[PDB]
Nucleic acid binder design. Sequence first.
RNA 1: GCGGGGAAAGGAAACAUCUUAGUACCCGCAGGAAGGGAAGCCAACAGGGACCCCCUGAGUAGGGGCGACCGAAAGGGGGAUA
RNA 2: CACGGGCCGGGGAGUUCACGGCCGUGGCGAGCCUAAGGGGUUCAACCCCGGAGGCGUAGGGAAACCGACAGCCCGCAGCGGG
RNA 3: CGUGGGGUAGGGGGGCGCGGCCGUGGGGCAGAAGCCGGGCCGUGAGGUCCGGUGGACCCGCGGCCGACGAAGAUCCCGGCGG
Lengths: 152, 140, 121, 155, 278, 121
Amino acid sequence: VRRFKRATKYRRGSRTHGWGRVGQHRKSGGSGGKGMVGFHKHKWSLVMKYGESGTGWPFYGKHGFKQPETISVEWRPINVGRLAELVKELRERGEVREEEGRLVVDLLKLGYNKLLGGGHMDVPLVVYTPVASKAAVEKIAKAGGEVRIVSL
Amino acid sequence: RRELPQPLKRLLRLRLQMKRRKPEFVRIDQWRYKRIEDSGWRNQRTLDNKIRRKWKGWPKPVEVGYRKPAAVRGLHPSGFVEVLVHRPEDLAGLDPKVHAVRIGRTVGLRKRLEIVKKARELGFYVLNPGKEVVELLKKE
Amino acid sequence: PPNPTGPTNRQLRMLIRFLRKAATANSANIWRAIAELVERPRRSRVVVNVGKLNRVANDGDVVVIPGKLLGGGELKKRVVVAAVSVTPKAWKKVVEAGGEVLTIPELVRRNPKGSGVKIVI
Amino acid sequence: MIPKPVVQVPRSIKSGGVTKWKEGRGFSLGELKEVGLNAEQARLLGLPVDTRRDSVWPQNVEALRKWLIEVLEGKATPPEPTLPKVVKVKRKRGRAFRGLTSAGRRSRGLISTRFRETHNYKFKKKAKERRLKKRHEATKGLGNVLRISRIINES
Amino acid sequence: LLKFKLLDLSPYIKPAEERPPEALKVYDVNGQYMADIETPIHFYEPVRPDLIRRAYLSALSARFQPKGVYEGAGKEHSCESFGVGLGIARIPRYKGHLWPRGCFAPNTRGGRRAHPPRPEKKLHEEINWKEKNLAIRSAIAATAYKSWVAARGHMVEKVPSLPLVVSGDAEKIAKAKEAKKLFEVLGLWPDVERAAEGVKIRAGKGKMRGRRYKEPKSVLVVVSELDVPLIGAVRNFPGVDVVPVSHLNMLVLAPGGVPGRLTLWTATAVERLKGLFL
Amino acid sequence: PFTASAQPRKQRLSLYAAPLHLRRKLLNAKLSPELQKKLGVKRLPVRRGDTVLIMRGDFKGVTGKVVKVDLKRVRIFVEGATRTNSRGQTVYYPIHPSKVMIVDVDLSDKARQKLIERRKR
RNA sequence: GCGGGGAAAGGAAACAUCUUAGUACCCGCAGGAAGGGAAGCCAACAGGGACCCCCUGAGUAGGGGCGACCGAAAGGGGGAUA
RNA sequence: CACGGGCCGGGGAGUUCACGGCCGUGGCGAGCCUAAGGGGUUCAACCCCGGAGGCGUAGGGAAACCGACAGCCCGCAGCGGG
RNA sequence: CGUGGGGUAGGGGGGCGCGGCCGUGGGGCAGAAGCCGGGCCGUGAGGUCCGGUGGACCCGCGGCCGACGAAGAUCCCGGCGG
Ligand SMILES: [Mg+2]
Ligand SMILES: [Mg+2]
Ligand SMILES: [Mg+2]
Ligand SMILES: [Mg+2]
Ligand SMILES: [Mg+2]
Ligand SMILES: [Mg+2]
Ligand SMILES: [Mg+2]
Ligand SMILES: [Mg+2]
Ligand SMILES: [Mg+2]
Ligand SMILES: [Mg+2]
Ligand SMILES: [Mg+2]
Ligand SMILES: [Mg+2]
Ligand SMILES: [Mg+2]
Ligand SMILES: [Mg+2]
Ligand SMILES: [Mg+2]
Ligand SMILES: [Mg+2]
Ligand SMILES: [Mg+2]
Ligand SMILES: [Mg+2]
Ligand SMILES: [Mg+2]
Ligand SMILES: [Mg+2]
Ligand SMILES: [Mg+2]
Ligand SMILES: [Mg+2]
Ligand SMILES: [Mg+2]
Ligand SMILES: [Mg+2]
């Protein structure tokens, strides 16, 4: 932790406090209005810098619809490579039941509900997951494991 | 009084010359207004300031060009290093060839007599024994 | 900005002084390069995961990390790695792969010239 | 140590199959029936009883059987019965003037919807938040400041 | 394993004072050496004055109470600006019989304070739990170094060794008179006398507010648990603090935000320490 | 009943605003060692008719009878601790009771004996 | 604290929808607290289980010259439990 | 010959919270932190508990829906060779 | 080492002073703060000492926090001039 002197300490004896002599420190006119205003008239050049040309889209307008969140699954996927790390830790503590001669993990008790295919699987694994991507099923099956799709 | 080496002896003499020619740094019109008569230096950030702009004939501003030689800076005019002393036990660790003893202004007469006696025995130059202590020791 | 001040941690400050002295004594530019990376502002200090050592290091390589070694990913190589600090999980992965974890002063004492040492950030 | 009922958290569609447990309001009548009690007897023993709940969980039954044996053998002391211990009804003055009759309750919205969704509740809730500057009322226009800042910093 | 804690910087940087020994010396209630015990891992932490200062300021700042002015102070008079054209400044003025008298503006007598304290101001400097506990371990380790303890200002000449560990039998002492004898035979009494003689009447307005006396800190006594008799036997000495080991904190371990507090551990307290603050 | 607060403002307000029955407690003075063994108590509130020894001030060492007690001022007048004004009259120095020691006790009052038995116990 | 009546200034860099704000203020009526409270509930085929208040969900869904700006609920953790 | 001050003393102006961006340090690190609240205390401090939730670990698309590297070259530091 | 040394607005870096707090070390009825005048130190903000006046508090050093620095606002309040 480092501590620094407040700017007011430096500004004593400076008449203007960093606001200049010409364009001094005034009220909301010095901001071009109160709040997030002006973006279509005098701050339109700020919209053109950051937003879509022609439409100024993110600043103004509508695009698409929202699928209602109360009827949409909130996904918590895990990659195959990250899963391989997880089972290694789980095995050391003894949380893995090697039920069938192979390590058995089920994603839902681990807090995940989908399996993705990034990374590498280095052990044969039985994975109980509601959803698994195409490469996840292949990579798990290439290591001697298997994906089992449960029904929500 | 303090015996200095020849390099420092010249710098001490040079410092005395710089002291005599040093301007008394004042704000503009400090002589006119009683309300700022006893003020310290102020570097006023103003439109028409002629001290900051160093106009000939106006008072001079403060600059690092006026700094005195670094090797003798802060020394007592006698050449010694002043040390503030508040009790006799504070005399430990000082060297009478390098240090002079300045007694704290609020040290009372009873404690001042003990400091002065111990310091004079040890050979220290005491800068400010005080009028009362001088009379008492002289009477002794 | 509040301009960079350097570390407040005296342990870090003494390590930086060590590396500069070691660079001068042994004419080793590596320990000067390490000290500059160690003295970086905190918000841009070097952190390396053990999984990165797989790509950038071969078996038997000696690696100096001018920062913290974090334990992320998996290590499959035998590496001798020195760093400013090592997290417990990073420590366990390096050792279990047969490697060794050193302090930077240990590496300098072992290899004053830093010959064959690879800088990894 | 009187057991606490364990019930399942309702599994939403949003959860995607992840489930968890929680402490329930009370033991269900089905669970009490397996240990030979009704709602009145269980309440007299200090147990929380939930006659609304339909589920029967074996872990709840097992906890009840263990604790009842301790109580009936003199090893555990039941707490006070989970029934009202005081009756405190105050004399009412000006029910009509304060909107507490059925006509007032209807106009306030309390017949058609929940208390939390009535308009007077919304007025009072927001007034408190603004008075204390709590949560989202510490910054007026917070949503638009976030929206514009996200566009600029995520462009 | 702890090679990263006690960093060896040889040969280019000369060593400092050695780490505390693998064992601690234990003395009986008569001041006679009794035995050794294994040093808890806490004493091998490097002393970190920067981190100790941060954790001390955090614990102290949680104690401050909110302050403020009355919300309407200087704002409740009936006043208005009377405009230009009257030959006087256009600040607000009293409306009634006091009329020309200035009012409301911060520059007027009886006006509002422009930027007063507010009770909503955050005074507490929060700290992460892990960071706070690392500082506590660092402060504990400093109690084992005579260099750090002396630099904080304690009298350590007569203390046989540091960390000062006394037998657990000391926890049965119930009278201040007997605890005084224990302190004298462990060489701790001179530091208690430093605190007794060092109490002064402090300068300034604190006298008006119940802060008349400023007292130096002398000895921190660490016991195994709450409600042992030794807590009451020592708590009346000037500058002495006593806590059970589980109650150790930065307020007693680094007064002034400075490491190294003259500490008397009991042997049972040192044993319990091995499972705390880690 | 005298505040428990540690704040000096509340300690002083208790002292100056104390009602008469509380101001009596401020009249306590230590008994001489001889009286302590005879009566078995260490302190008694000073009473008119007692004999006290003054231990501090200009009249230190003067023994005399208490002639008047002022509850409002918490001061007592003692024979011998006097002086004369410019008009020649004899006036008494008001002495604080904490500065005197009672050397003889006036016990003609039955109500006073109850206080002694309470403190002797 | 409960019921009712009910603005404008200011903001939107003008301004009317809007906001400010069901606010200021007015009228009525209670208590030491008031109001709320015991499923014509919520959910989604898995289950919660009267109510109020605190933390969160969340400035999310949604309303809006879709502008300024406004803004939940279910669920989760607690206080307390009838 | 632009405006302000007769003089002196005292008073007299970038503050706080919420949210966002960035910097300087400090802790921990594929994780980080607890909120409300609870237990203890030498009682607003302090010790311990509390992981709900938030941010991060994966993105693309309006949405249904789908879902990710160590292969080659140039080359600073550094290291090695002459 | 520099064919280095002007500077408004503005940006960046360091220091002085005021009130309190956490520590540490001291002074004071043989005279604290304050006040009038003076010497010395520092480029400076300022520090320090002496003589007089005064009559009980105050200061050095490290850290931390602010109701923290005035020459001016037809500034405010009081006092007092030509
Ligand atoms: Mg401008
Ligand atoms: Mg212009
Ligand atoms: Mg202006
Ligand atoms: Mg436009
Ligand atoms: Mg459309
Ligand atoms: Mg000009
Ligand atoms: Mg004086
Ligand atoms: Mg809002
Ligand atoms: Mg006022
Ligand atoms: Mg702060
Ligand atoms: Mg003062
Ligand atoms: Mg307004
Ligand atoms: Mg408008
Ligand atoms: Mg208009
Ligand atoms: Mg009630
Ligand atoms: Mg009611
Ligand atoms: Mg509204
Ligand atoms: Mg004009
Ligand atoms: Mg004029
Ligand atoms: Mg220049
Ligand atoms: Mg200081
Ligand atoms: Mg000015
Ligand atoms: Mg006037
Ligand atoms: Mg006149």
